[PDB]
Amino acid sequence: LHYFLCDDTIEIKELLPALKMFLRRSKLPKNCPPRVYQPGQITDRAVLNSYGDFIKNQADGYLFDRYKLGKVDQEFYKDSDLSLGVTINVWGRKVLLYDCDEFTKSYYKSKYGIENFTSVSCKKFPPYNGFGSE
Amino acid sequence: EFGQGHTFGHLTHDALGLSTFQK
Amino acid sequence: MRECISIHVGQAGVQIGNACWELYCLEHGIQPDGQMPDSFNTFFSETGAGKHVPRAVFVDLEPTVIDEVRTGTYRQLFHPEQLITGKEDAANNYARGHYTIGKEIIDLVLDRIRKLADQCTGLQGFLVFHSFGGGTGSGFTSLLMERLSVDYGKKSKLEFSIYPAPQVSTAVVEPYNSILTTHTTLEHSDCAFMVDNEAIYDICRRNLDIERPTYTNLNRLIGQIVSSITASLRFDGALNVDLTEFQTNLVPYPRIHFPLATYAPVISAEKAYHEQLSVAEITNACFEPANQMVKCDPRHGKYMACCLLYRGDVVPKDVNAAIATIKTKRTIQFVDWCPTGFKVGINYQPPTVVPGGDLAKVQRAVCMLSNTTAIAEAWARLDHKFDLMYAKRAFVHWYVGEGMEEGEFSEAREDMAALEKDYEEVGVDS
Amino acid sequence: MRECISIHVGQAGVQIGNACWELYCLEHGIQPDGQMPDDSFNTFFSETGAGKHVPRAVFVDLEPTVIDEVRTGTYRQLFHPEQLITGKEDAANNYARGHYTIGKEIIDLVLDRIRKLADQCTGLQGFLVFHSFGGGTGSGFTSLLMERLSVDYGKKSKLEFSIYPAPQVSTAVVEPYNSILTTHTTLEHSDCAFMVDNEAIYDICRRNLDIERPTYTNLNRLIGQIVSSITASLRFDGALNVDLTEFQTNLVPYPRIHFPLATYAPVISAEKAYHEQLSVAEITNACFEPANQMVKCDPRHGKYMACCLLYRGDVVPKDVNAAIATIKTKRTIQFVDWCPTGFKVGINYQPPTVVPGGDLAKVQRAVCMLSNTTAIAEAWARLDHKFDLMYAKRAFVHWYVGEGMEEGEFSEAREDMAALEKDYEEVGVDS
Amino acid sequence: SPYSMDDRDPRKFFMSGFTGYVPCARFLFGSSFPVLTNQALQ
Amino acid sequence: MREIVHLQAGQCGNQIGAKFWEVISDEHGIDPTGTYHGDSDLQLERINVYYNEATGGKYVPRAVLVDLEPGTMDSVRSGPFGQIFRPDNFVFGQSGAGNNWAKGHYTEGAELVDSVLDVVRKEAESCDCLQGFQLTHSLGGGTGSGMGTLLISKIREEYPDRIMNTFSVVPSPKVSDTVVEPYNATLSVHQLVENTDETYCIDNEALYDICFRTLKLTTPTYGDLNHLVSATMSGVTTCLRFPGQLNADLRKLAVNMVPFPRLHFFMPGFAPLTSRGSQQYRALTVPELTQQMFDAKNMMAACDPRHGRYLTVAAVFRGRMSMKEVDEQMLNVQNKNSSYFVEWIPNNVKTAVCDIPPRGLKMSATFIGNSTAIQELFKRISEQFTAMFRRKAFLHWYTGEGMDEMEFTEAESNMNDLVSEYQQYQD
Amino acid sequence: MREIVHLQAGQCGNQIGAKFWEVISDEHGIDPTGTYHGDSDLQLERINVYYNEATGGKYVPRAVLVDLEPGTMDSVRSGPFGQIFRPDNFVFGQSGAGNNWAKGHYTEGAELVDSVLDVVRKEAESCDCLQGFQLTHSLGGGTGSGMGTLLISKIREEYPDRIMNTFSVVPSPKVSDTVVEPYNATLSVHQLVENTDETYCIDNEALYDICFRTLKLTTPTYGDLNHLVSATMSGVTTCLRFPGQLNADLRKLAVNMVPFPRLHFFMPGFAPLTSRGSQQYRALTVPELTQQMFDAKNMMAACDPRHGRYLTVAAVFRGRMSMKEVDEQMLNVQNKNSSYFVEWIPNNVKTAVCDIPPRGLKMSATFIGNSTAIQELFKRISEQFTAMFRRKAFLHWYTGEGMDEMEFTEAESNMNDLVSEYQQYQ
Numbered sequence A: 001l002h003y004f005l006c007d008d009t010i011e012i013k014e015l016l017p018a019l020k021m022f023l024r025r026s027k028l029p030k031n032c033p034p035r036v037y038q039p040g041q042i043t044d045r046a047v048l049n050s051y052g053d054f055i056k057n058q059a060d061g062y063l064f065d066r067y068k069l070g071k072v073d074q075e076f077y078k079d080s081d082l083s084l085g086v087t088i089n090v091w092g093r094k095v096l097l098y099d100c101d102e103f104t105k106s107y108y109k110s111k112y113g114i115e116n117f118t119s120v121s122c123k124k125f126p127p128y129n130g131f132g133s134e
Numbered sequence B: 001e002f003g004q005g006h007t008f009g010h011l012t013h014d015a016l017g018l019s020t021f022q023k
Numbered sequence C: 001m002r003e004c005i006s007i008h009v010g011q012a013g014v015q016i017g018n019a020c021w022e023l024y025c026l027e028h029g030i031q032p033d034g035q036m037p038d039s040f041n042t043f044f045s046e047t048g049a050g051k052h053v054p055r056a057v058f059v060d061l062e063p064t065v066i067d068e069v070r071t072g073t074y075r076q077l078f079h080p081e082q083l084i085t086g087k088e089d090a091a092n093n094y095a096r097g098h099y100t101i102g103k104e105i106i107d108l109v110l111d112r113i114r115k116l117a118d119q120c121t122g123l124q125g126f127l128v129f130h131s132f133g134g135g136t137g138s139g140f141t142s143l144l145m146e147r148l149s150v151d152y153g154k155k156s157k158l159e160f161s162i163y164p165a166p167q168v169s170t171a172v173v174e175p176y177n178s179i180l181t182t183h184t185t186l187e188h189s190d191c192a193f194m195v196d197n198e199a200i201y202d203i204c205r206r207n208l209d210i211e212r213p214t215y216t217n218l219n220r221l222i223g224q225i226v227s228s229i230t231a232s233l234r235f236d237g238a239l240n241v242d243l244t245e246f247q248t249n250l251v252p253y254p255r256i257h258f259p260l261a262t263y264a265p266v267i268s269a270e271k272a273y274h275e276q277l278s279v280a281e282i283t284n285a286c287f288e289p290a291n292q293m294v295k296c297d298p299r300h301g302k303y304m305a306c307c308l309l310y311r312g313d314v315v316p317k318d319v320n321a322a323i324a325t326i327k328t329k330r331t332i333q334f335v336d337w338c339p340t341g342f343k344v345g346i347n348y349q350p351p352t353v354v355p356g357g358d359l360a361k362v363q364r365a366v367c368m369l370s371n372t373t374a375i376a377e378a379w380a381r382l383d384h385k386f387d388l389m390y391a392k393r394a395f396v397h398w399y400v401g402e403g404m405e406e407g408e409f410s411e412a413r414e415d416m417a418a419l420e421k422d423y424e425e426v427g428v429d430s
Numbered sequence D: 001m002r003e004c005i006s007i008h009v010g011q012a013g014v015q016i017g018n019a020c021w022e023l024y025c026l027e028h029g030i031q032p033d034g035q036m037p038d039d040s041f042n043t044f045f046s047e048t049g050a051g052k053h054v055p056r057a058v059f060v061d062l063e064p065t066v067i068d069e070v071r072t073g074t075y076r077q078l079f080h081p082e083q084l085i086t087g088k089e090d091a092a093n094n095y096a097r098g099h100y101t102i103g104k105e106i107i108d109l110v111l112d113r114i115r116k117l118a119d120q121c122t123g124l125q126g127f128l129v130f131h132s133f134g135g136g137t138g139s140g141f142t143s144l145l146m147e148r149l150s151v152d153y154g155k156k157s158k159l160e161f162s163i164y165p166a167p168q169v170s171t172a173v174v175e176p177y178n179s180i181l182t183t184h185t186t187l188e189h190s191d192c193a194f195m196v197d198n199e200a201i202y203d204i205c206r207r208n209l210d211i212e213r214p215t216y217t218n219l220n221r222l223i224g225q226i227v228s229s230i231t232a233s234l235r236f237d238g239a240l241n242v243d244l245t246e247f248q249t250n251l252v253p254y255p256r257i258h259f260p261l262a263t264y265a266p267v268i269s270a271e272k273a274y275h276e277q278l279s280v281a282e283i284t285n286a287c288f289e290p291a292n293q294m295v296k297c298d299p300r301h302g303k304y305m306a307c308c309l310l311y312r313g314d315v316v317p318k319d320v321n322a323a324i325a326t327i328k329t330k331r332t333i334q335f336v337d338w339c340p341t342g343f344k345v346g347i348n349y350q351p352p353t354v355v356p357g358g359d360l361a362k363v364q365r366a367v368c369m370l371s372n373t374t375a376i377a378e379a380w381a382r383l384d385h386k387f388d389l390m391y392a393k394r395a396f397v398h399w400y401v402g403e404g405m406e407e408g409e410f411s412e413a414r415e416d417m418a419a420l421e422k423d424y425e426e427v428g429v430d431s
Numbered sequence E: 001s002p003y004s005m006d007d008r009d010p011r012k013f014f015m016s017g018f019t020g021y022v023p024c025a026r027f028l029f030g031s032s033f034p035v036l037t038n039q040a041l042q
Numbered sequence F: 001m002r003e004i005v006h007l008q009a010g011q012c013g014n015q016i017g018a019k020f021w022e023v024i025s026d027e028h029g030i031d032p033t034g035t036y037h038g039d040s041d042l043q044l045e046r047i048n049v050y051y052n053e054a055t056g057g058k059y060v061p062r063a064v065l066v067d068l069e070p071g072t073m074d075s076v077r078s079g080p081f082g083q084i085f086r087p088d089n090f091v092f093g094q095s096g097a098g099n100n101w102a103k104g105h106y107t108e109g110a111e112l113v114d115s116v117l118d119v120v121r122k123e124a125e126s127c128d129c130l131q132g133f134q135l136t137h138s139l140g141g142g143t144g145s146g147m148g149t150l151l152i153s154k155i156r157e158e159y160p161d162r163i164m165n166t167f168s169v170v171p172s173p174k175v176s177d178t179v180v181e182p183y184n185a186t187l188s189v190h191q192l193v194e195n196t197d198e199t200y201c202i203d204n205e206a207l208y209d210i211c212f213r214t215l216k217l218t219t220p221t222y223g224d225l226n227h228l229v230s231a232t233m234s235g236v237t238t239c240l241r242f243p244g245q246l247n248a249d250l251r252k253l254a255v256n257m258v259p260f261p262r263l264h265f266f267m268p269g270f271a272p273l274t275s276r277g278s279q280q281y282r283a284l285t286v287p288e289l290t291q292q293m294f295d296a297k298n299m300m301a302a303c304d305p306r307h308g309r310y311l312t313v314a315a316v317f318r319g320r321m322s323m324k325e326v327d328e329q330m331l332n333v334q335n336k337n338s339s340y341f342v343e344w345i346p347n348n349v350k351t352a353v354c355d356i357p358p359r360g361l362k363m364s365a366t367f368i369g370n371s372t373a374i375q376e377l378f379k380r381i382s383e384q385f386t387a388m389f390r391r392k393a394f395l396h397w398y399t400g401e402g403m404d405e406m407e408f409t410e411a412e413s414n415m416n417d418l419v420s421e422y423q424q425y426q427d
Numbered sequence G: 001m002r003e004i005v006h007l008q009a010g011q012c013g014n015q016i017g018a019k020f021w022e023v024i025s026d027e028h029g030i031d032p033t034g035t036y037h038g039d040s041d042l043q044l045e046r047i048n049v050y051y052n053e054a055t056g057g058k059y060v061p062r063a064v065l066v067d068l069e070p071g072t073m074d075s076v077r078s079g080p081f082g083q084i085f086r087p088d089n090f091v092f093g094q095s096g097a098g099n100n101w102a103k104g105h106y107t108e109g110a111e112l113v114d115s116v117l118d119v120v121r122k123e124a125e126s127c128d129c130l131q132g133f134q135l136t137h138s139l140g141g142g143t144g145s146g147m148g149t150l151l152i153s154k155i156r157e158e159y160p161d162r163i164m165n166t167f168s169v170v171p172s173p174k175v176s177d178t179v180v181e182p183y184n185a186t187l188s189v190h191q192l193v194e195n196t197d198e199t200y201c202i203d204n205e206a207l208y209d210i211c212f213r214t215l216k217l218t219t220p221t222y223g224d225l226n227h228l229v230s231a232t233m234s235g236v237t238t239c240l241r242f243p244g245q246l247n248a249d250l251r252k253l254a255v256n257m258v259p260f261p262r263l264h265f266f267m268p269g270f271a272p273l274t275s276r277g278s279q280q281y282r283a284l285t286v287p288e289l290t291q292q293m294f295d296a297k298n299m300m301a302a303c304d305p306r307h308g309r310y311l312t313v314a315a316v317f318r319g320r321m322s323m324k325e326v327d328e329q330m331l332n333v334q335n336k337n338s339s340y341f342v343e344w345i346p347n348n349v350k351t352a353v354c355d356i357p358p359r360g361l362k363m364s365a366t367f368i369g370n371s372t373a374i375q376e377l378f379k380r381i382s383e384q385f386t387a388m389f390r391r392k393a394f395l396h397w398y399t400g401e402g403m404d405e406m407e408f409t410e411a412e413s414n415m416n417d418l419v420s421e422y423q424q425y426q
């Protein structure tokens, strides 16, 4: 599991007894196998209405409001949310983290001040006759 | 479901006091 | 398992490739020695011990530019047989580099290419780096190209050439070697990208605010463009482009395959964060007449086909609104027979910068690949420079002294007259 | 349990065995003292109750200079003291000196030790001979030894590893005489003669190992590697083993057509092993390239006959069959129209072992190929072209008539090799 | 540069095919190019 | 019980279908592993339409994935629901098509269809009673436009009495992202008009305009754009997987909506599309749904229906609703827009009502229209083709790989033959 | 009850039999020590067929292990299941045959067969009711092709009222591991066709193809190819040592698949074959087994069956499973592929059903088949032999041991008669 700190996005590779993929660099939802919402429900900015006049710029032509009415409760995994020895629901799959790399250890002990990372382990002759010399 | 002879030698031999039923 | 093979011929091709392979290692996290503390297959091969080896052949007749790579900081990266050297240079001489010394190591070069080719499970194209005006940059690549054209039939053949600039140039025999190279590029070369020194010089003064650039500044900037067009093979994106299609949808006639390159946004560190660098203005900087990377005026000619290659955080709608913004401008003239001339490409990798460089850390970039008829005026001022050489037969006897005839001068001249009348024929309205 | 006999004759055969028997004691872990610090060594060594192991070779030369180097050298306490037969007067680049007068005095002792060595082995495979054409001892002594071995041991296989003279560089002057007079008896009393040319090893060492100016130690270690490659099947386990007769029936189709080649791959130094990848399909394509061959001939002008491949180390039979299929689809390689099957494959598990201080890298998979080819007819032609020019003036003759040989056998040997060139052309032509 | 580099360092050698001059290299034989140049630099 | 075989060709067809299998797995309660996890049994009585049972209680899709480039198959395996697909159904070439119709249909595509059709046929005798095929592709590429016409030619040559669901992405006038789009469209409509029972036309400009007016989305990326197509993709065949009150399968849709053998290009639509802010302000009722159907901004094609006439209209409802309100409202829209519907056909409108709405909504409806306004989509392609055909630009690439000058004129002639039918019946 | 004697000759026969004695030991639950460690008692009721009882509960295999070169028997004893073989059953010579049929038949393999015949005859009288012989070798070698066909000749003249089931690994053109094997192939099919009743042709190219496209393994070593062969070895006779509902022995297969005394060349198969990464997505059903028995990809011989017509086909099923689905689908494949079977005989398919599937599987099916597509298997050896004997090459190794050149002409004449009869009846 690679967690990029630039975009807070998670990608996964596999280790065949190679790489393949098994996942893509996207945001990982946290709670439950999520339903695919109706379109338009996942936008980032709440808008009131477009400008009434016909001539306008398309990107600018939106007025935003002060109430965010239809917020869906979408929770995404983060560096605080995932740590060592924590069960993670990858799209319905229970995944256990058991060790990590030295840069991850250094980043965690620098940011959150956690000092201990214990790597969880996962795993004549026949008898003789007397008719001759032994 | 959605909701949820022992030996060839001992069978041909060693039959003095034992019958076929006794073996 | 789609691969590209690189050949670097001449001092210009070798020195650009030093910055080109430096960038590729920095893109991918591969250390200079060759290990780590799947997008590598396109340009590297993973050995059993964990080493990674490039897919380039560094060949030149003059050892003094190969030796500085052998003694340089990238000595553990390459294979010691891939770095072919010679005995004496071409010395700015097309006769010397093609038919006097160029035959003595040409079979060595051919077997290394074949030894590299059968290792690749899937081949896609060639990337040849050279310069027009050089002896090795003309003599070696002309001999090399027709042998690979008859060895491999349908493979794409991409070249990157240093155009001798109109006003400024280094050597004197430059008009001769520029004409004598084109008689191979018109038939065996599939798509030859073209760039000059003076336009990179001009951009470094204004955008980067460099008062006194060197070739170290140029080679990094050329390396960014060539790393931007091959990004779709390694990294993923919203819609990717392989080597075959962006030269499919760009070459409409068999003799019109000479595009122009443009990079955006090129900027220094101080002015970048003051600017707003969104999608709607990085593509408008491409079509400014002061930002094209070949010294010519695009307003005189009309655009023929264009390719836009976006990298980083780019929303696909911001591309389409920018294109419709471009098509409403009067100065951006298009040919009537081509209704749609724009090709897009989106990649999910932001650009990177080498440490100790100049370019800023910018979330997005676009590379513009423009086929246009404005390059005819660049060839007219070079054909005129040829005609004053050939009128008084100056510098000729260094060509007949190695065993080659005089009639190829006139044959290449009417070849250039054939090429410059092609643009005037295809540039008219119907 | 399966045992072989090796015979080393002449200064070349002795100097090959200095770097040939070095390899066997190293890879079996046998000390130069002769003691082991479970029967894979029985092919090349015999066990003594004290614990010492004694090799199974004979070292014969007519001058005591080169044996004395071995006798006082590193391997003094390894060879038997009667496996080193000495002679006082060298043959001195003369066929007659080695074959009639001096060689008759010590052949009874040489055949005494051979019969003594043959009676110790419960199961005998055959004989392996190491000598050189251009020397008096390497021509005279082996010619009399083979006619005295074909009388005593009839059905046993005889194989040679000869030093074939180079077209341009040579040591002596009279070797066109001395090479045709020693190949007169090989066409009737030999059965397989692998020939290695010295300057072909020179060009391999120049452009692959990058040794600029090599010497005999570089040559004999490579030749020592090729004999370990051909014999590795009897010594160790594998997917399918190879007998001496198995690659003999696979290589010789005629009573007279028995002249194969030899080539080793991969042959690189240590610093090239890390960068390149030594695939199975690559080490078999280096063998078929003409620049890697150990005889200075062009196989493109020649005509392939029968190829035997011997794989050592971590190999996969699927890769071998794919590699063979890729060999058959290149058209620079041609086969006769009467031998449609032209490949024999042998597999051995053991990878190569490199001596400390050697010029070779640690190789995880290697291959030996043994190709019969009529391209040697080009090499017999120039060897006979340089014979008739120097025979027409009757130069360098008077010792041959003064030491025991009649002159009239000169035309007999020329007639035999003329028919030999005539026989190579009859096999090479199709219907 | 390998010339002034310390002797105990394993990098004190040149790759094969190097046309640059190495002192005390013409007086050496029977060995491969990088180790020959390595002992020449020693 | 009815069986549908799915095929995905090209880059655009693969990503839309990858969103398609994600949507209907959610509707039937299928985990990404392939394990059933639902709440009601009505999603389980008809699962053999799209899925095949495997040992251990795992469900695999009945889809065949093909492209000439291995790059997109690594992405399809990479998806959130990429693990369910059969690895035996992943067939591909090695040389990219390069947006060349000849490189997908004649030169390199002829060496892959021998292996494509074996896997495609292997699912057919695995099925008991086959019904039809769905093939998702784009008309502008060199893979989907070329091989999609090649595959339907080979399928129809040996399944005569079946039906074809060709969900083609048509080229766009201003969102053109390739310079040879008129070439790859005119060379693919030759085989689409003859060997396809119905084709659903989707562009990118009308999808983008929906995302800015009805949905008010700031950044409508491709992962959101493909969801609009996938909703209508799953809404057309709801009568085969769910109980209803007035059922209508694919052949019933074909009989009611195809009056002439070469008029089968449709404009689809989705009714309950809302903006995010107006979720709690809107009354979701049938007249509100019917008003959103026949809105000129809600059709997924770049054709204005006010610039033409309607042949035959269908609407498939999902959820709990009456039948008087459905029939009266969709009779009132016929009387009010009486000039738009043709006078020589009575009862232009066909209704269909199911009983299970999609998850997360009280009711939904899918709108399918056949109109004369689709002639403008083909007119701009033909007049773009002629300007390039006149100067013979980008032509030596096709003719360098087995094509000729002759076949381009026949393709444009069949374009003009197809366009002339719509304007003939308009007046 | 019905004992089968197993004979192993050549290096190929020794390696396959070493794998064969491993699978049936695992099926009957026999550890390499020699005891019995199993759960079900059905593996013990029929145990005398393949294994012999010895004092102390130790079971020993009834097999004969013969090879002139003693190289391979060191590997056999050093294998995982090598302790069970009797040292009195290890009969070997001193020198190898050297890829020569002459030395393997008349000089070096001429005095060892006295020792082989006494072990075979001793084990023959130890059996209660002998059922027949099964033997494994290679035609492309010197010992297996030489002494194998010699032992077929000497046993047939002494046991006339028995059967021979030969499992011959025929050579392939591209996988040609020898240069002389056209001579050995033609000179062994002369002795094969007259003294064998049932012969199974196995190829290496077919096995390498299967492990690539069906099993998807990138390192197919010989320890895996012999496992695929050993599956058909244990599945041909699974109704002789296990209960069922429709039992069939080797004689019933012989009288249902051999209509003529010369048309007895078969082509084997085994088809619950899946990869490791695709086990989750396949339904193990009788329709899916029936589909993949009959395709050209699963045959263990390098022949395309669609270029010819079948004569007889037999299928042996294992597992608790129905019968209408068997009888319908065996009828369905005859009706659909009507042009792939000859029209002058009806009901070309024989079905046999057992009770016990092998370990780690749910149901199994073993395919054996007579076909006229073996013409292409023997035509290539014809053209190889004619173009090679034309110049009399590779011949002094044969005439220097006692045989005249006329035997080469007779072998071509017999084989030309064998390709005449299959083409006549196609």
Ligand SMILES: Nc1nc2c(ncn2[C@@H]2O[C@H](COP(=O)(O)OP(=O)(O)OP(=O)(O)O)[C@@H](O)[C@H]2O)c(=O)[nH]1
Residues within 6 Å of the ligand: C009, C010, C011, C012, C015, C016, C062, C089, C090, C091, C092, C093, C131, C133, C134, C135, C136, C137, C162, C163, C164, C169, C170, C171, C197, C215, C218, C219
């Ligand atoms: N962009 C760029 N161009 C270079 C560089 N080095 C040399 N050139 C070009 O090379 C041209 C002259 O060629 P030469 O200097 O003779 O080098 P060459 O092409 O290898 O030819 P010869 O050295 O004579 O064999 C100049 O006009 C430069 O434009 C460089 O580092 N960057």
Ligand SMILES: Nc1nc2c(ncn2[C@@H]2O[C@H](COP(=O)(O)OP(=O)(O)OP(=O)(O)O)[C@@H](O)[C@H]2O)c(=O)[nH]1
Residues within 6 Å of the ligand: D009, D010, D011, D012, D013, D015, D016, D061, D062, D063, D090, D091, D092, D093, D094, D132, D134, D135, D136, D137, D138, D163, D170, D171, D172, D198, D216, D219, D220
């Ligand atoms: N390749 C190789 N050839 C050797 C070696 N030693 C000797 N020779 C060959 O021996 C030839 C010279 O023969 P001589 O000097 O007469 O030695 P000889 O063959 O033993 O004959 P005599 O000196 O009479 O005993 C040279 O041409 C070499 O080819 C060696 O170590 N390696």
Ligand SMILES: Nc1nc2c(ncn2[C@@H]2O[C@H](COP(=O)(O)OP(=O)(O)O)[C@@H](O)[C@H]2O)c(=O)[nH]1
Residues within 6 Å of the ligand: C238, C239, F009, F010, F011, F012, F015, F016, F097, F099, F138, F140, F141, F142, F143, F144, F145, F169, F175, F176, F177, F178, F204, F222, F225, F226
């Ligand atoms: N809706 C949608 N359209 C796409 C996507 N990817 C590509 N396209 C469209 O497909 C057209 C190009 O098709 P192309 O990829 O060349 O087809 P191919 O060559 O057969 O794979 C462009 O005009 C895009 O608008 C996607 O993910 N979603």
Ligand SMILES: Nc1nc2c(ncn2[C@@H]2O[C@H](COP(=O)(O)OP(=O)(O)O)[C@@H](O)[C@H]2O)c(=O)[nH]1
Residues within 6 Å of the ligand: D240, G009, G010, G011, G012, G015, G016, G097, G098, G099, G138, G140, G141, G142, G143, G144, G145, G146, G169, G176, G177, G178, G203, G204, G207, G222, G223, G225, G226
């Ligand atoms: N498939 C397979 N073939 C084998 C095996 N062992 C040997 N062979 C084949 O046997 C042939 C060589 O036979 P060989 O050992 O020389 O026969 P022999 O000399 O009479 O014992 C080669 O072509 C191999 O393909 C094995 O384990 N599996």
Ligand SMILES: [Mg+2]
Residues within 6 Å of the ligand: C010, C011, C060, C062, C065, C089
């Ligand atoms: Mg230079």
Ligand SMILES: [Mg+2]
Residues within 6 Å of the ligand: D010, D011, D061, D062, D063, D090, D091, D137
């Ligand atoms: Mg001497």
